[PDB]
Amino acid sequence: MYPEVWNFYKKAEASFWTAEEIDLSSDLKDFEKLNVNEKHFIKHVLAFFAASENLASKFLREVEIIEAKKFYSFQIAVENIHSETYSLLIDNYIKDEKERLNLFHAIENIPAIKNKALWAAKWINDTNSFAERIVANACVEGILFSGSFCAIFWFKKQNKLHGLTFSNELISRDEGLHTDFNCLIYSLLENKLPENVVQNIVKEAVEVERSFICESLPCDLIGMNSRLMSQYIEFVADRLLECLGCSKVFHSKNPFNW
Amino acid sequence: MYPEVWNFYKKAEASFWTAEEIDLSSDLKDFEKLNVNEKHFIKHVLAFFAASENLASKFLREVEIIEAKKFYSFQIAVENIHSETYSLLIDNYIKDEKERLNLFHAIENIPAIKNKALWAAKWINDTNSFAERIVANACVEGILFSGSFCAIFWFKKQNKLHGLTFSNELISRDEGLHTDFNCLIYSLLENKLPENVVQNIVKEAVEVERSFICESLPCDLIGMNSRLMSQYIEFVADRLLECLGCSKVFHSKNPFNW
Ligand SMILES: [Fe+3]
Ligand SMILES: [Fe+3]
Numbered sequence: 270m271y272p273e274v275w276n277f278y279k280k281a282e283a284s285f286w287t288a289e290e291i292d293l294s295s296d297l298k299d300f301e302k303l304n305v306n307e308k309h310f311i312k313h314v315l316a317f318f319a320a321s322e323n324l325a326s327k328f329l330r331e332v333e334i335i336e337a338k339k340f341y342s343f344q345i346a347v348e349n350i351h352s353e354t355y356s357l358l359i360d361n362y363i364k365d366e367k368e369r370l371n372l373f374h375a376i377e378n379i380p381a382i383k384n385k386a387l388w389a390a391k392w393i394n395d396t397n398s399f400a401e402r403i404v405a406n407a408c409v410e411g412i413l414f415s416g417s418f419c420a421i422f423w424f425k426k427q428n429k430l431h432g433l434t435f436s437n438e439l440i441s442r443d444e445g446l447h448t449d450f451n452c453l454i455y456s457l458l459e460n461k462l463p464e465n466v467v468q469n470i471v472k473e474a475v476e477v478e479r480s481f482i483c484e485s486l487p488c489d490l491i492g493m494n495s496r497l498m499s500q501y502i503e504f505v506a507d508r509l510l511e512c513l514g515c516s517k518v519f520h521s522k523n524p525f526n527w
Numbered sequence: 528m529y530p531e532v533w534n535f536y537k538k539a540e541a542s543f544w545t546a547e548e549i550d551l552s553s554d555l556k557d558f559e560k561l562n563v564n565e566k567h568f569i570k571h572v573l574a575f576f577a578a579s580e581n582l583a584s585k586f587l588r589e590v591e592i593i594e595a596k597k598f599y600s601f602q603i604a605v606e607n608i609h610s611e612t613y614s615l616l617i618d619n620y621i622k623d624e625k626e627r628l629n630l631f632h633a634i635e636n637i638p639a640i641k642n643k644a645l646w647a648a649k650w651i652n653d654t655n656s657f658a659e660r661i662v663a664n665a666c667v668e669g670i671l672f673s674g675s676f677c678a679i680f681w682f683k684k685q686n687k688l689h690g691l692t693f694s695n696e697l698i699s700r701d702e703g704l705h706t707d708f709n710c711l712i713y714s715l716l717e718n719k720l721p722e723n724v725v726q727n728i729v730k731e732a733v734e735v736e737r738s739f740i741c742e743s744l745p746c747d748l749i750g751m752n753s754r755l756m757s758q759y760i761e762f763v764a765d766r767l768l769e770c771l772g773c774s775k776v777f778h779s780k781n782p783f784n785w
Contacts, residue, residue: 283547287540326584339607346604349597 271457274336277450281343284446286439288353293361296431300362303429306490311433312363313486314417316372319355321385324393324409331399332454340450347443354436362433381485384477385413392470400455400462401470407451407513408474410444415505416482416498418444419525423493426527452512464515472518475506500524529715532594535708539601542704544697546612551619554689558620561687564748569691570621571744572675574630577613579643582651582664589657590712602705609701612694620691639743642735643671650728658713658720659728665709665767666732668702673763674740674756676702677783681751684785710770722773730776733764755782 300308325344332338363369376382392405418441425434455461482488482498489495503519510517558566583599583606590596621627634640650663676699683692713719740746740756747753761777768775 282545285543289541326587329584339611342603342607345600349600353597 271334271336273453274334274340274457277446277453278336278340278343281340281347281443281446284443285347287350288357291354291357291432291436293358293432296429296433297361299429299431307492310420310486310488310491311430312368312372313376314420315355315359315362316376317379317381317417317481317486318414319352319359320376320382321413322389324406327394328403328406337454344447351440351443354440358433358436379485381477381481384480388473388477391473398462400458400460401466403451403455403458404462404467404470404513405474407448407455407509408471410451411448411509411512412471412474412478412502412506414444414478416478416488416502419498419501420482420488420491420493422527423488423491427492448509449512452514455513461514467513467515468510468518471506471510475502475519478502497524529592529594531711532592532598532708532715535704535711536594536598536601539598539605539701539704542701543605545608546615549612549615549690549694551616551690554687554691555619557687557689565750568678568744568746568749569688570626570630571634572678573613573617573620574634575637575639575675575739575744576672577610577617578631578634578640580647582667585652586660586664595712598708605701609698612698616691616694637743639735639739642738646731646735649731656720658716658718659724661709661713661716662720662725662728662771663732665706665713665771666729668709669706669767669770670729670732670736670760670764672702672736674736674746674760677756677759678740678746678749678751680785681746681749706767707770710772713771719772725768725771725773726776729764729768733760736760758782 300311303311325341325348329338329341329345332341359369363372388405389409392401393409395402418437421430421434421437424430425437479499479502482502483495487495488498500521501524503521504523507517507519507521558569561569583602587596587599587603590599617627621630646663647667650659651667653660676695679688679692679695682688683695737757737760741753745753746756758779759782761779762781765775765777765779
């Protein structure tokens with residue numbers, strides 16, 4: 270078998286959770302005590318998470334190793350559970366349906382999606398190299414939403430938002446596992462990529478990610494600094510290059526120790 | 528939204544379980560207390576379960592309702608857990624690699640496979656009607672293996688095999704849920720089939736199923752009766768037709784109340 274891969278499965282499995290353990294009960298009081306620029310940051314972020322797609326199922330049919338198909342088929346279930354958690358959150362902070370939608374079109378045309386899709390067109394759901402796909406994959410599950418995830422933790426450091434932050438917790442922890450996973454498949458990889466290509470994929474993922482949190486929907490107005498955040502991406506990116514067995518490209522220290 | 532389909536998801540989810548909860552520790556003593564005809568019945572049925580494919584994934588792409596892809600994407604993870612449990616059981620009852628292999632090489636040419644495969648070619652994995660697919664699916668997950676599942680209850684009535692019968696129980700219960708499901712989608716169906724054709728599919732499922740437990744690997748000597756089994760299928764298949772909103776075809780009462 271492939272014993273290190275099986276450890277990721279048993280860890281995802283034994284780490285399984287559902288939307289029932291969340292109980293948004295206790296803080297829309299927090300959200301109405303929040304202020305006016307912070308309110309639509311959240312309303313936009315949650316609506317951004319609910320937009321992105323087929324991915325694991327495309328590697329489910331490619332990766333011909335039972336241990337790994339098992340991890341990916343388990344990925345889609347857990348990822349569906351992240352999806353419901355958001356629909357449930359979008360259900361509570363954005364309670365009445367007028368505004369739900371007034372605000373789903375509102376994203377569609379949000380250059381962060383211009384960037385996110387165009388990138389997905391160039392590297393993912395593509396037709397040249399499998400190697401390229403997992404690298405671009407490990408960015409999707411590593412670099413993308415990295416910014417958004419950190420910005421909900423800025424509410425967790427204020428002891429506000431009730432499982433906006435606790436769900437956020439489980440979801441990023443989860444998405445962390447997926448990331449190390451695509452590293453290991455890279456690590457098992459027949460003919461690895463030249464570091465020159467991997468860094469392009471990565472840089473572009475970074476530039477794509479930043480057009481969310483620093484530009485489209487600026488963290489610089491939940492209390493954060495867009496430039497410090499821009500540095501968090503860099504550091505996330507570098508971490509990821511090391512997990513991919515590559516040398517860094519932005520050498521940048523942890524802007525937040527939290 | 529489709530609230531009845533949501534209920535089957537939340538009942539799958541809330542009914543989730545893993546291979547860790549079985550721990551086969553306590554009865555290969557039973558296995559070796561058993562006799563020759565039962566030994567290889569079991570070694571063959573376990574090997575039969577580990578041979579059949581992609582199914583729900585094919586419906587995951589077709590059925591364009593969130594609540595339902597949710598149920599299907601979770602089906603494939605729980606069906607992976609069924610698989611693993613079987614692999615683990617083949618690992619204990621058939622401990623030495625010698626035979627793991629001379630056994631999937633008996634099986635992989637058994638007349639029940641020629642049956643199983645051919646009927647999968649005529650109805651499933653097909654290019655004519657989606658209605659047919661669900662009916663044929665409801666059979667895959669309703670009539671097929673019903674014989675084999677009942678044969679393992681035979682061993683549960685004798686207070687033997689530790690979770691051969693206990694997993695057997697969680698897997699049947701689970702397959703039970705997936706059958707009920709396919710009923711509901713046919714029940715929400717745009718244009719339902721004429722019962723003339725539904726009965727053909729089921730007949731042929733029935734015949735295919737019987738070629739396993741009453742012919743290829745006869746329950747008739749783990750202690751059971753082949754004919755009585757053959758009527759359990761009919762009864763099972765009758766129940767299915769009611770579940771599918773059709774009249775019966777072999778009106779036959781419960782041969783076993785257990
Ligand atoms: Fe993920
Ligand atoms: Fe099933």
